[PDB]
Amino acid sequence: SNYVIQADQQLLDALRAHYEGALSDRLPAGALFAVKRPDVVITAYRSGKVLFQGKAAEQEAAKWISGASASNETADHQPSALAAHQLGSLSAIGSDEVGTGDYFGPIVVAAAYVDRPHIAKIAALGVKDSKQLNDEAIKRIAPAIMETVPHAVTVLDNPQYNRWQRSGMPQTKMKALLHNRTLVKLVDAIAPAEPEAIIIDEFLKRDSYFRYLSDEDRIIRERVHCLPKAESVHVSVAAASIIARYVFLEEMEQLSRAVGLLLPKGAGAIVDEAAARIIRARGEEMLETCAKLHFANTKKALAIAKRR
Ligand SMILES: [Mn+2]
Known about the structure:
four-stranded antiparallel sheet; Ribonuclease HIII; TATA-Binding Protein; cytoplasm; Nucleotidyltransferase, domain 5; nuclease
């Protein structure tokens, strides 16, 4: 009939290695592999969902999980993998940012163009782990990317950040401008070559994004894709992410040195303590050069600084 099961990475590896006849070509979007056993076909997906169809359905299914739920689903495309199925193999530019949630430091937006002939080399660097990678990995992988693939970066320093923020421009509009300006740099730099796609890791509705670029003299919208969790759609986005994290870290060391005090990431208690210290040793005005003032941490800092 038709049975569906959920599988962790190990079960997926087991299901795959078991069948001495796995297929990787011509498969529904999102599928990892498929097998054609005596009156039964197994279909495995990234999500972990496995589809058992055929005569010997419940039989084959039971071989792995007891109480295998049955549904009407079929070996069809997964809506979550429609874009990646199409974009994953093209030559594209991917952009992402970081530091948005950090009290100290700027907002960094980066973009990377990964042509088809470089996708593997970049994937070989293990960039598909941008989310979970400590500062050490970033400092080792990022530099190997910057010198393998063309990229652009835009850094929104604190004084300019505070300037826009107190002028009515919220972070959402800041990111739209930063992304649009980084993409412009990259598009011109890689010319005459043109990217088959331009993927932006979604941070706001496409409607809003371009509605914020109303004043820009140059806007990039030709073949622009706004996708959620873009790092998983194309390797160029994961690359941008890593590069952005790198420039951020380098910017923080430089900034901590200019402030003369180690500036911790995030916006937790240590951040207030750190700001408090700065206020006492360099004056409140120094914060305007290394922090996002409108943040709540500023008031708390001023309190901690005043009490003692
Ligand atoms: Mn993002």
